[PDB]
Design an enzyme around this catalytic site. Structure first.
Site, mmCIF file in Angstrom:
data_model
loop_
_atom_site.group_PDB
_atom_site.id
_atom_site.type_symbol
_atom_site.label_atom_id
_atom_site.label_comp_id
_atom_site.label_asym_id
_atom_site.label_seq_id
_atom_site.Cartn_x
_atom_site.Cartn_y
_atom_site.Cartn_z
ATOM 1 C CG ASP A 82 3.132 -2.284 -9.439
ATOM 2 O OD1 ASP A 82 3.815 -3.422 -8.796
ATOM 3 O OD2 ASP A 82 2.784 -1.455 -8.194
ATOM 4 C CE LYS A 103 1.874 -3.825 -4.742
ATOM 5 N NZ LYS A 103 2.703 -4.229 -5.318
ATOM 6 C CG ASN A 149 -0.070 -0.327 -6.483
ATOM 7 O OD1 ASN A 149 0.561 -1.325 -7.675
ATOM 8 N ND2 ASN A 149 0.349 -1.000 -5.718
ATOM 9 C CG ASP A 165 2.548 2.961 -7.427
ATOM 10 O OD1 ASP A 165 3.270 3.506 -7.870
ATOM 11 O OD2 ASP A 165 3.194 1.976 -6.492
ATOM 12 C CB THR A 196 3.815 -7.138 -6.813
ATOM 13 O OG1 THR A 196 3.639 -5.948 -7.237
ATOM 14 C CG2 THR A 196 3.826 -8.443 -4.889
#
Lengths: 230, 382, 325, 382, 325
Positions: free
Chosen positions: E154, E156, E159, E172, E189
């Site tokens: 995840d 990005k 995060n 996260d 995402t």
């Protein structure tokens, strides 16, 4: 005969004697030498009976006879007062001037009293009364009282002198007192005749001693109003 | 009144002291005017009476009169009933019986005459008159017409006629003493006054007609003359038939008249038997007209039997007699006798004959020169 | 018998006076006049006395003119002829007869006696013996009269007088008539009439005997056999002959009366063969001495007790017919 | 006034001589009363009122007008402006890839299925799927009938299916801010909602049918499971064919998976050439089915000439591999290889193999006790 | 080299904590409570202070019951097991863990710093030197994680946190998963998804390196290499692998990026024979002192700037499953 005593009804109504005083004065302002002809203040009376009392005993007898007369006069009046109305003027032949007694039922009653008086006195031994007709009057002047008047041209009462009093109501006298008077003795202080004795007729005078009271007066007021309407 | 009226007002003024004299006067005298209550009304009803009375008796009496009543009662009084009256003689008018010499015609129908006969049957004077006399008598009856109210006879009046009513009604009246009674009436039938036919005598009753009627009348004189004349003629005739009979020739006049007085008559029609053979012989006959046949049945002729028929012994005529043997014997009739045609005979009873004249045999002997002759006649041949 | 003698001499004496009436005999100036008993209802009979003999007689005054009216004038002219011709002890007598303008004056004998009718009625009835006494006198009188062929025809108590000797004396011959044969006037008195008279059959002597029967019956009964209030009934009874006898009548009397009151002439006594002897010999008359009665020797049973001036006409009137008198 | 009153009455009584003094008094005193005057009539009355007011007031209250509002007023927009620059991680539903244990039937005609294939050619998720998976996927597509006016998908709504149009017409709408535009239509052709097969996300447009139509639908979960399951099965199968190859025994698990990730598959019809003798050796094969004949034209055996024909050196079957020398040398192919019947081989590029695991010679030496063996296998006789 | 030392000692330390998770460590009454910044659109994260030590931590409030719904309850029970077993300088820390009727409370370390996303977006893009600085930290972090067979999945800007020292701190672990072999959840995402994920071919460590390529590109450009308005287009671009680099990108950078954004797994850096060294030895990272970055001795180019009252249930609920925690 010549009397020396008389029964007298004195004039006690002041209006009568005051009216006569006025009459006398009006005559005198017209002719002042008539002064001594006027009868004296206080002497006014009606003669009821003349007589002779010629000594002390007879003077006492007169007094007794007067007392004895009282019930007789009460009998005669039958419970009514005797009212003597004096109205107008007259003369006896121009020598004596008098207020007249008005005509009415009283004149006969008065005459009856005079005759009963005469009888009562004579029955006690007193020469009393006269043969001439009883003509009661109220003298106010007598020319004989002033002798010098003849002596100076005044020999009669001039009728013009009392003209204004010819129908003048002098007033009314109710019979009450009767006096036994001396003609010749000295007059009293108040001008009246010498009085040996007096009686009073009145009870004094009512049918009933107790007051009505004043109920009768209505009779006097009415009778007087009727007399005035005539 | 014036002073007293005004004194009442003035007393009230003095007592009440009203403010206004005049208004008080209006009220006082108005109320005095109202005051009098004098008017009054009286209605009187009263009972006035006297308390006592004294009563004295009275002797007077009062009477009244009854209404009159009228009554009549029949009265019978008998005075001294006697049964002692003397009887006066009577006498009819005389008359020559013996016929003067032939010298009454009133028509009548059969019905009228027949009615008269009937009306007369019982009247004694008519009762036993012969045919002829009755006829002559009716012939003599005259008619009498009567108007209603008419008096046929009046009691007391003399009587001359006998009357038979023919028509009408009648009232009969009889007066006895002072009373008159309407005793009976007749209505188209009757007769009266028979006594008048005997002699003149007073009518015993009064008869008045009450309608139109008719009566048959008969005058005494006419009636007596008819009868006497006829009986005196008959007597003369009987006398003759006795006189011509020889058997009675010795009879004196007066003796023949005794016979005439009682002797009878009989009529026989042709063929009828007069005498029957065998019956008892009581009388004898004398023919005055016609003929008679005498028959005998020939049996009484021997001893039992024979003829037994009819045989004519004799035949007599006017003037002859038969049955004579009854006068002299007393045996049954020998023969019968029959009328030959119309016959009229005089019949005499033998017993009466003897009582009157004695036995016939003595009469026959009276005249002795004819005694034999007479005997042969009576008991002889022919 | 003397009976025949008497009658023979009687007929002689009679026929002589009969065929030569003794007319105007005595004179009226021989007789004076006494009482006047003769009124009644007919005739004027006045008593009278005689001159020389000075006897009493009964004179009948018959004004010659008075006649002509009445009922008859012959029943008198005849009556006179009979009275004058007859003579019997029990018969009144015509003593003297005369007339002239007065005419026909009868001077009858006078017997101051009594009437038979008054006597009989008073006592009611006679005893049979007394009746028989009077009867005998009438029988004898009838025998005499019939001997002369005269019939009386008016027998009745009223016509019989009882003389001072007590014997009968017959008066009034008004109906007396001489008849030989038959006569016919219906006369007599109702009670005493015979059937034959009432019926007009003709008659003679037999009516007198019938009347006798009536007369005898009434004497012994007081009343007649056929009495009735009405004449008619009397006659009807008479004709019927039926008679009723009082209880007291004796047998002999009844028998005699049945024979006298016989309507049948063939059976009436007096009319038969023996005539008056059938009566004289009847049992009722057995104690009767006929001669004695005739000579008036028998003692009778009863002795009886004992005006104006008329003139003639100085002229004879009806004498132009009353010649015979 | 009492004596005067009585006197006046007396004077008139003396003048008039009334017989009735009481009646005269009533009248006299009544008349005396009358003379007095006088009664007065009441005056007319008028009412008038007059008043003055002098008051001054400082204070008064005045209120005026009214408030009326025609319509409600929109609330003022907030002054503050908020801007967001952040995207949440997406995530599909998890699933146990490894086949649980065999435990979707929707009929389709050849034409329909054939048409579905065409409609899916260009869709990236479908674009490069093998024959089998595509079939299983079409099998799983259910039919959805739609009536005109119906909404197939509505913008904003969550999405779960992908749709292929079978029949009908449809309008496509897209709302941007407050505006909605009818942007395009479909007429019996089309597909949409592919994104829904990846994860759950809002529908970006609204599709409404404009007639009766039919659509083939596919649910994400069904689609993902079909695919994962199949690729995980394929992986296990590839893994096995690599594992049983002895040359690769020294390989670690993760190293075999790198191969599995990229290794290819090829199908050969009987008789067709797979490897041609002479061309460059770039890859090696592993037979997973069928057989392969290896031939060599015997000329490259001397100095110019000979055989020049066909000779079979080897003959491989299921599980065997050929072309291995490309992994250890760089000389043209020694021989040709032809498919003996229907063949399926796993094909691996040598250069890719080296980049991933390094040269094959090192791998062969990893396990030293088998190095010789391996060497003799690769360059040895048989 | 020490690299092997570190990782060896690292795997040891990890396997120990992995096969014996440290459950319910500290007590809730040792920590108070301050602000409450933990809303957004999920979970309840509130700041808190410690007692004795008095430190600041970030406590995630996960109502034991709140779970069960949502998308999953394992991607968490697993997330917790990892955070607790791992230890790296550029990784957030699970300081204290505990639960009971409240249950499952995460006491994460707290760095009062700034977000990577906010910083990058403001300044637009980082200079290559600055980008290389952050990149190095992520390479090292991925080498550590992959050493433990854990994939982040995840990556990005969103995060990544920049701490007060200016170094990166990764947050996260929602998609973190231990995988030896291959895995298949389509997650991450959009902008950062690997072709193999989009297409479900199965995958492991290679996706993190691809994401790094995306992450490095965006930092040096300001925007991601496969950007588009529609998710569909993003994926089609991702699958085509075609990338266009800005003019200003240096050569070494472009080359490194062509090797990270390789759709072809046989050519992708990190996935080849040398693994992470192909990256560490790339010309773009030549001026990088890997040890220095690890010890955080290098000077970062940017120093960042620097409610309610819930209660238990007095009773443990979903503890009949969340035992392991």
């Amino acid at each position: 005969y010549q009397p020396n005593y008389f029964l007298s009804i004195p004039i006690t109504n002041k209006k009568i004697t005051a009216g006569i005083k006025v009459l006398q004065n009006s005559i005198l302002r017209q002719d002042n030498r008539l002064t001594k002809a006027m009868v004296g203040d206080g002497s006014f009376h009606i003669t009821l009976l003349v007589m002779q009392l010629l000594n002390e005993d007879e003077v006492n007898i007169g007094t007794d006879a007067l007392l004895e007369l009282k019930p007789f006069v009460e009998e005669i009046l039958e419970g009514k007062h005797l009212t003597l109305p004096f109205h107008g003027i007259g003369t006896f032949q121009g020598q004596v001037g008098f207020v007249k007694l008005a005509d009415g039922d009283h004149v006969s009653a008065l005459l009856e009293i005079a005759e009963t008086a005469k009888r009562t006195f004579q029955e006690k031994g007193i020469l009393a009364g006269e043969s001439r007709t009883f003509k009661p009057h109220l003298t106010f002047m007598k020319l004989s009282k002033a002798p010098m008047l003849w002596k100076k041209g005044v020999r009669k009462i001039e009728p013009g002198l009392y003209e204004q009093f010819i129908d003048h109501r002098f007033g009314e006298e109710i019979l009450y007192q009767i006096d036994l008077c001396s003609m010749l003795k000295k007059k009293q202080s108040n001008g009246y005749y010498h009085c040996e004795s007096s009686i009073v007729i009145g009870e004094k005078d009512r049918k009933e001693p107790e007051d009505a009271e004043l109920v009768r007066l209505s009779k006097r007021l009415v009778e007087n109003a009727v007399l005035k309407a005539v | 009144g014036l002073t007293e009226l005004l004194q009442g007002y003035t007393v009230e003024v003095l007592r009440q002291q009203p403010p206004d004299l005049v208004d008080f006067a209006v009220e006082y005298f108005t109320r005095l005017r109202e005051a009098r209550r004098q008017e009054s009304d009286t209605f009187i009803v009263s009972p006035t009476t006297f308390h006592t009375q004294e009563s004295s008796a009275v002797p007077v009496i009062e009477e009244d009169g009854e209404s009159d009543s009228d009554s009549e009662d029949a009265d019978l009084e008998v005075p001294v009933p006697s049964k002692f009256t003397r009887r006066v003689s009577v006498c009819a008018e005389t008359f020559n019986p013996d016929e003067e010499e032939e010298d009454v015609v009133h028509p009548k129908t059969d019905e009228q005459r027949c009615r008269l006969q009937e009306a007369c049957k019982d009247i004694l004077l008519f009762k036993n008159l012969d045919q002829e006399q009755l006829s002559q008598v009716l012939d003599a009856m005259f008619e009498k017409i009567v108007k209603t109210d008419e008096h046929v006879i009046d009691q007391g009046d003399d009587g001359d006629n006998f009357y038979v009513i023919e028509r009408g009604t009648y009232d009969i009246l009889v007066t006895k003493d002072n009373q008159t009674r309407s005793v009976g009436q007749y209505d188209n039938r009757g007769s009266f006054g028979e006594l008048a036919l005997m002699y003149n005598t007073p009518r015993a009753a009064t008869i008045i007609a009450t309608s139109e009627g008719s009566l048959w009348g008969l005058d005494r004189v006419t009636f007596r003359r008819i009868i006497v004349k006829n009986n005196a003629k008959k007597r003369k005739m009987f006398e003759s038939f006795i006189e011509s009979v020889p058997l009675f020739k010795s009879l004196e006049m007066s003796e023949r008249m005794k016979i005439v007085d009682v002797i009878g008559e009989k009529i026989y029609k042709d063929g009828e038997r007069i005498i029957a053979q065998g019956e008892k012989a009581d009388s004898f006959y004398i023919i005055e007209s016609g003929e008679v046949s005498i028959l005998i049945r020939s049996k009484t002729k021997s001893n039992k039997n024979g003829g037994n028929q009819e045989v004519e012994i004799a035949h007599c005529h006017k003037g002859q007699y038969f049955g004579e043997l009854a006068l002299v014997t007393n045996k049954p009739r020998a023969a019968s006798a029959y009328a030959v045609g119309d016959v009229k005979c005089l019949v005499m009873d033998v017993q009466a004959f003897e009582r009157l004249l004695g036995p016939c045999m003595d009469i026959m002997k009276r005249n002795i020169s004819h005694y034999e002759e007479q005997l042969v006649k009576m008991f002889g041949s022919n | 018998e003397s009976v025949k003698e008497f009658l023979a001499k009687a007929k002689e004496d009679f026929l002589k006076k009969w065929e030569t009436p003794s007319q105007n005999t005595a004179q009226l100036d021989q007789f004076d006049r006494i009482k006047t008993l003769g009124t009644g209802s007919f005739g004027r009979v006045m008593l009278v006395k005689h001159k020389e003999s000075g006897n009493h007689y009964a004179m009948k005054i018959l004004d010659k003119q008075k006649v002509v009216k009445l009922k008859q004038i012959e029943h008198t002219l005849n009556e006179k002829r009979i009275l004058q011709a007859v003579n019997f002890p029990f018969l009144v007598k015509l003593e003297f007869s005369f007339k002239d303008n007065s005419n026909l004056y009868m001077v009858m004998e006078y017997v101051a006696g009594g009437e038979m009718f008054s006597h009989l009625r008073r006592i009611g009835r006679f005893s049979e013996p007394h009746a028989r006494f009077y009867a005998a006198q009438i029988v004898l009188t009838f025998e005499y009269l019939h001997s002369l062929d005269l019939i009386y025809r008016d027998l009745k108590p009223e016509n019989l007088l009882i003389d001072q000797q007590g014997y009968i004396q017959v008066t009034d011959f008004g109906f007396a008539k001489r008849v030989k044969g038959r006569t016919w006037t219906l006369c007599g008195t109702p009670e005493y009439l015979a059937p034959e008279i009432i019926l007009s059959k003709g008659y003679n002597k037999a009516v007198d005997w019938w009347a006798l029967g009536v007369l005898i019956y009434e004497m012994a009964a007081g009343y007649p056999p056929f009495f009735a209030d009405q004449p008619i009934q009397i006659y009807e009874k008479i004709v019927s002959g039926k008679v009723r006898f009082p209880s007291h009548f004796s047998s002999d009397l009844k028998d005699l009366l049945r024979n006298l009151l016989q309507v049948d002439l063939t059976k009436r006594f007096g009319n038969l063969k023996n005539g008056v002897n059938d009566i004289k010999n009847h049992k009722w008359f057995a104690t009767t001495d006929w001669i004695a009665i005739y000579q008036r020797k028998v003692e009778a049973p009863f002795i009886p007790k004992f005006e104006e001036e008329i003139r003639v006409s100085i002229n004879e009137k009806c004498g132009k017919e009353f010649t015979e008198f």
